C-alpha cells in the first residue's frame, strides 16, 4: 500500500462553547472518503483460496480498528458521517469486494463498533450539569464499562491474539466477544441508552400536554407538573427497574442491571 500526502494536524478545538464537560476537545482525524492516507489495495487480488488468510488478516485489522470507532482500510464510515457534528448518525460501509463470509462477520462486528461509538458519545453528552446526577452517574458507569471492560477485552484478548496467537480468525474474534459477555453487557447498556433516547424524543415532541390529599392535610405544597426535556432521578431509576423486569430469567443480565442500579 502506497502513501498519500495529506495534512494531519492534531490540535485542540477552537470553540468549546457547545461541547459537554467531558466532550472531546481535539478535532477528528482525516476521513478515508475525503482524505485517504493510503491507496486502498483492492481485496479482489487476494480472493484466491490460498491468499484467503491474507484478506482475513486485513479484515481482522480493520475490525480491531472499527471496534473503537476508527474506520479501517476496507471498513469505513458511510457518506452521511460528519465527525464535527456530534449528533451525526453512525454506520459503517464494508468493501464490496470483500469475501462474503468476511462481510457477514464484519457486519456483525461493526454492530459492536457502532455501539461503542454511540455509547462514548452518550457519556460525553450526559456528563453535563443539565442532565442530573443520575444520568451523570450512568454516564460514569458507561465510561468505566468501556475503559475497564470493553477496551480491556479488546486489547488484552483481541489485539494480543491478533499479534501473538496463530489460528486466530474472524469467527474466533466473534466467539471471544460472545464468551466474555462484552456483547451482552454492551447490548444492555445500549438498550438503556436507546430507552433514554426515546424518552428524550417523546419529551421533546410531546409538548401538547397540560391530588386532594395535599388539601385534606394542612400542606402549603403544590405539584410541579413540568415534564422536563430529559428524565431525571426517579424517571430513570424507573427505566432501570423496567429493564430488570424485561430481563427476568437472564440471571447474568439481571445481575448486571441490578449492579448498575445500585451504583447509579
Amino acid at each position: 500500500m502506497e502513501i498519500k500526502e495529506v495534512d494531519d494536524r492534531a490540535e485542540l478545538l477552537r470553540y468549546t462553547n457547545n461541547i459537554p464537560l467531558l466532550g472531546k476537545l481535539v478535532n477528528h482525524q482525516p476521513l478515508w472518503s475525503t482524505n485517504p492516507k493510503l491507496k486502498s489495495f483492492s481485496l479482489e487480488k487476494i480472493s484466491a483460496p490460498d491468499q484467503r488468510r491474507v484478506q482475513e488478516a486485513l479484515v481482522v485489522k480493520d475490525l480491531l480498528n472499527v471496534l473503537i470507532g476508527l474506520e479501517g482500510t476496507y471498513i469505513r464510515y458511510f457518506n452521511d458521517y460528519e465527525p464535527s457534528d456530534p449528533e451525526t448518525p453512525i454506520e459503517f460501509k464494508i468493501a464490496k469486494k470483500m469475501d462474503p463470509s468476511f462481510k457477514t462477520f464484519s457486519r456483525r462486528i461493526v454492530r459492536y463498533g457502532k455501539q461503542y461509538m454511540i455509547l462514548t458519545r452518550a457519556y460525553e453528552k450526559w456528563s453535563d450539569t443539565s442532565f442530573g446526577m443520575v444520568l451523570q452517574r450512568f454516564a460514569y458507569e458507561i465510561r468505566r464499562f468501556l475503559e475497564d471492560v470493553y477496551l480491556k477485552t479488546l486489547v488484552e484478548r483481541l489485539e494480543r491474539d491478533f499479534n501473538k496467537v496463530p489460528n486466530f480468525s474472524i469467527r474466533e474474534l466473534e466467539q471471544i466477544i460472545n464468551e466474555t459477555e462484552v456483547n451482552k453487557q454492551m447490548e444492555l447498556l445500549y438498550n438503556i441508552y436507546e430507552e433514554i433516547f426515546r424518552e428524550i424524543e417523546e419529551r421533546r415532541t410531546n409538548q401538547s400536554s397540560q391530588n386532594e390529599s395535599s388539601l385534606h392535610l394542612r400542606l402549603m405544597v403544590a405539584f410541579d407538573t413540568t415534564v422536563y426535556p430529559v428524565p431525571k432521578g426517579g424517571a430513570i431509576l424507573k427505566i432501570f427497574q423496567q429493564k430488570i423486569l424485561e430481563n427476568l430469567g437472564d440471571r447474568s443480565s439481571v445481575m448486571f442491571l441490578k449492579k448498575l442500579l445500585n451504583n447509579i
Partner: peptide
C-alpha cells in the same frame, strides 16, 4: 482442502464464495 476451508464457515450458518 478448499471444501474444508469453506465448511469452516458454512458450519456457522454463514455464506461464502464456495457454499453460497
Amino acid at each position: 482442502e478448499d471444501i474444508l476451508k469453506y465448511v469452516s464457515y458454512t458450519l456457522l450458518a454463514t455464506t461464502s464464495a464456495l457454499f453460497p
